[PDB]
Design an enzyme around this catalytic site. Structure first.
Site, mmCIF file in Angstrom:
data_model
loop_
_atom_site.group_PDB
_atom_site.id
_atom_site.type_symbol
_atom_site.label_atom_id
_atom_site.label_comp_id
_atom_site.label_asym_id
_atom_site.label_seq_id
_atom_site.Cartn_x
_atom_site.Cartn_y
_atom_site.Cartn_z
ATOM 1 N N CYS A 414 0.892 -1.161 0.000
ATOM 2 C CA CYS A 414 0.000 0.000 0.000
ATOM 3 C C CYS A 414 0.942 1.227 0.000
ATOM 4 O O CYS A 414 1.758 1.318 -0.932
ATOM 5 C CB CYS A 414 -1.027 -0.007 1.138
ATOM 6 S SG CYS A 414 -0.354 -0.301 2.789
ATOM 7 N N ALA A 416 2.723 2.769 3.287
ATOM 8 C CA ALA A 416 3.736 2.364 4.270
ATOM 9 C C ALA A 416 3.926 0.832 4.323
ATOM 10 O O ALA A 416 4.898 0.343 4.875
ATOM 11 C CB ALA A 416 3.373 2.901 5.648
ATOM 12 N N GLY A 417 2.973 0.102 3.766
ATOM 13 C CA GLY A 417 3.036 -1.340 3.705
ATOM 14 C C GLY A 417 2.746 -2.031 5.021
ATOM 15 O O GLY A 417 3.265 -3.124 5.280
ATOM 16 N N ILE A 418 1.930 -1.398 5.869
ATOM 17 C CA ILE A 418 1.615 -2.029 7.144
ATOM 18 C C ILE A 418 0.138 -2.110 7.457
ATOM 19 O O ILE A 418 -0.257 -3.068 8.098
ATOM 20 C CB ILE A 418 2.412 -1.379 8.299
ATOM 21 C CG1 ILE A 418 2.125 0.155 8.409
ATOM 22 C CG2 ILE A 418 3.933 -1.654 8.082
ATOM 23 C CD1 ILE A 418 2.781 0.870 9.590
ATOM 24 N N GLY A 419 -0.657 -1.104 7.081
ATOM 25 C CA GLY A 419 -2.066 -1.081 7.464
ATOM 26 C C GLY A 419 -2.960 -1.892 6.566
ATOM 27 O O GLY A 419 -3.440 -2.954 6.959
ATOM 28 N N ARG A 420 -3.213 -1.382 5.358
ATOM 29 C CA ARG A 420 -4.010 -2.094 4.365
ATOM 30 C C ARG A 420 -3.239 -3.357 3.971
ATOM 31 O O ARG A 420 -3.854 -4.395 3.782
ATOM 32 C CB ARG A 420 -4.259 -1.215 3.100
ATOM 33 C CG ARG A 420 -5.027 0.068 3.370
ATOM 34 C CD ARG A 420 -5.063 0.873 2.086
ATOM 35 N NE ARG A 420 -5.570 2.226 2.285
ATOM 36 C CZ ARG A 420 -5.757 3.096 1.298
ATOM 37 N NH1 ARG A 420 -5.520 2.744 0.047
ATOM 38 N NH2 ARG A 420 -6.233 4.305 1.549
ATOM 39 N N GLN A 461 -3.252 -1.752 11.400
ATOM 40 C CA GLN A 461 -3.095 -0.475 12.097
ATOM 41 C C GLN A 461 -4.209 -0.048 13.002
ATOM 42 O O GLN A 461 -3.943 0.633 13.994
ATOM 43 C CB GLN A 461 -2.869 0.648 11.064
ATOM 44 C CG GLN A 461 -1.454 0.653 10.485
ATOM 45 C CD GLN A 461 -0.444 1.201 11.462
ATOM 46 O OE1 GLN A 461 -0.512 2.359 11.882
ATOM 47 N NE2 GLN A 461 0.482 0.362 11.890
#
Ligand SMILES: COc1cccc(-c2nnc3n(Cc4ccc(C(=O)N5CCC[C@H]5C(=O)O)cc4Cl)c(=O)c4ccccc4n23)c1O
Ligand SMILES: CC1(N)CCN(c2cnc(-c3cccc(Cl)c3Cl)c(N)n2)CC1
EC number: 3.1.3.48
Length: 480
Positions: A414, A416-420, A461
């Site tokens: 996505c 930052a590559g952490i939430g979605r 997240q």
């Protein structure tokens, strides 16, 4: 420890907690506009309140930076002074919370569970008239130890008087109570109450929706993030700094993807982590920067990935979330030593599929098809109101991956590559168990998430994403 996080306090209580029980440099964090957070800091006899916003991608601190977790934010600012402000705000002394609501073993108003689910050393704490009970399983039997609460202090009938239930629990975990005839009351693990049988999800979702249960479960998971502060040294290297989209959101060293393609100084870095639940694996990464597109293709080639999942638009709210790292339809491009052809683009309601041909320059026999699933309809903030779209997309991704012999990990990104990214990956992991083991299988949502978070910081997240995972798994079972 994450004792500086108080889940059930207001701004006024926060101000009074810091003014009467803190000093200059004392601080705490708390939840709010719900979905937001506040960092309350004592400085020169006065309390400063700092907003922390998270719409699903990262924890965004006002006058500060973007972080993967509240524990990483607090760890960073306590270690790096002069970063929080025009006058500097110092985080010196965590003001500890004595509230046990976000503890894994605390079950407020509550033997059937310990007998059914428990094993040797499984324990819980429940409320008795203002007193508490510590129930332990050993083997096999259940022993109940009464916890007296006298003048805000807790005790088991003698010895030390603890300021919180957490201090009492931690003490008797290190130093177990021994019964006269020799039974050691070992508090090994909290009783598991989150593991459900997949067919009973609708029932769990209904109970978690009551006054909400989802928030309490999520905040108890958040309290465990202090165990996941693994080194992120490689990402901090001077030569790697501009390879990070967000300077303070870094890949764990132990799971980071190491690039061996190596142009002969520091050619081995990408802000990406292998996520293990190869063909059944994932690479969770950030949206490309103009200077990381070549590294991105080197990663895809090296790992033998045949499927990419993009869960962001290139641009959201007039901000670049990911550069266009693929050629226009029918076009051919070279990105360093890698060559990519976009063979065909197919547009569906929620997503676009791009059929890409990746090969290494000067080596024809290295060509492989890379399928790019670009989810385009995820809202700018929050989560979709219905998970059908996400599920239909994930189903398609799963079948493409399954059809390709010896495919490497599925790449998921996505901003930052952490939430979605974490949300799509966790839904996919949970749904995969229901594919393999069938509807009569056990699923544990926070267990799966904790496991993914030990591989990349802050995977999943928000509470809205947490609830979306439960809704997605519910919808998948209902359509079976
Ligand atoms: C067993 O566990 C571990 C074992 C070994 C290392 C770590 C470790 N890994 N990362 C971090 N971070 C995150 C971080 C650090 C630096 C910068 C940064 O860019 N730099 C470089 C120039 C100036 C400085 C600055 O910005 O001030 C940005 C971030 Cl996000 C911390 O904060 C941190 C704080 C206390 C202890 C370890 C920390 N730790 C660790 O967790
Ligand atoms: C009523 C209560 N206080 C809130 C819900 N609750 C729990 C329990 N366990 C987890 C859990 C499960 C697996 C891994 C991890 Cl790391 C965690 Cl934290 C969880 N998220 N919530 C029980 C106690």
């Amino acid at each position: 420890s994450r004792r500086w996080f108080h889940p059930n306090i207001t701004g006024v209580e926060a101000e009074n907690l810091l003014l009467t029980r803190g000093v200059d440099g004392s601080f705490l964090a708390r939840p709010s506009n719900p979905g937001d957070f506040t960092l309350s800091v004592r400085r020169n006899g006065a309390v400063t309140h700092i907003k922390i916003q998270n719409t699903g991608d990262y924890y965004d601190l006002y006058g500060g930076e973007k972080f993967a977790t509240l524990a990483e934010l607090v760890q960073y600012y306590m270690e790096h002074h002069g970063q929080l402000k025009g006058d500097v705000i110092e985080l010196k002394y965590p003001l500890n919370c004595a509230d046990p609501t976000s503890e894994r073993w605390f079950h407020g108003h509550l033997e059937k569970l310990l007998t059914e689910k428990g094993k040797h050393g499984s324990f819980l704490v429940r409320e008795s008239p203002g007193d508490f009970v510590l129930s332990v399983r050993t083997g096999s039997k259940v022993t109940h130890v009464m916890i007296r609460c006298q003048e805000l202090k807790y005790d088991v009938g003698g010895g030390e008087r603890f300021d919180s239930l957490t201090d009492l629990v931690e003490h008797y975990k290190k130093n177990p109570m021994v019964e006269t005839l020799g039974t050691v009351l070992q508090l090994k693990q909290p009783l598991n109450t989150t593991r459900i049988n997949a067919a009973e999800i609708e029932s769990r979702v209904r109970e978690l929706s009551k006054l909400q249960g989802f928030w309490e479960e999520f905040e108890t998971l958040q309290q465990q993030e202090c165990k996941l502060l693994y080194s992120r040294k490689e990402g901090q290297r001077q030569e790697n700094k501009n390879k990070n989209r967000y300077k303070n959101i870094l890949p764990f060293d132990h799971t980071r993807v190491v690039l061996h393609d190596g142009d002969p100084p520091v050619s081995d870095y990408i802000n990406a982590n292998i996520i293990m639940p190869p063909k059944k694996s994932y690479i969770a990464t950030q949206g490309c920067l103009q200077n990381t597109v070549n590294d991105f293709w080197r990663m895809v080639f090296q790992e033998n990935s045949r499927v990419i999942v993009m869960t962001t638009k290139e641009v959201e709210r007039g901000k670049s979330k990911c550069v266009k790292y693929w050629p226009d339809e029918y076009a051919l491009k070279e990105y360093g030593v890698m060559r990519v052809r976009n063979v065909k683009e197919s547009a569906a309601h929620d997503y676009t599929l791009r059929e890409l041909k990746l090969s290494k320059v000067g080596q024809g026999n290295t060509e492989r098809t890379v399928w790019q699933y670009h989810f385009r309809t995820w809202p700018d903030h929050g989560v979709p109101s219905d998970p059908g779209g996400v599920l239909d997309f994930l189903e398609e991704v799963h079948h493409k991956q399954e059809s390709i012999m010896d495919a490497g990990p599925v790449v998921v990104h996505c901003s930052a590559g952490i939430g979605r990214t974490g949300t799509f990956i966790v839904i996919d992991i949970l749904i995969d168990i229901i594919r393999e083991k069938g509807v009569d299988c056990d699923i544990d949502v926070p267990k799966t998430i904790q496991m993914v978070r030990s591989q990349r910081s802050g995977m999943v997240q928000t509470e809205a994403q947490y609830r979306f995972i439960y809704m997605a798994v519910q919808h998948y079972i209902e359509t079976l």
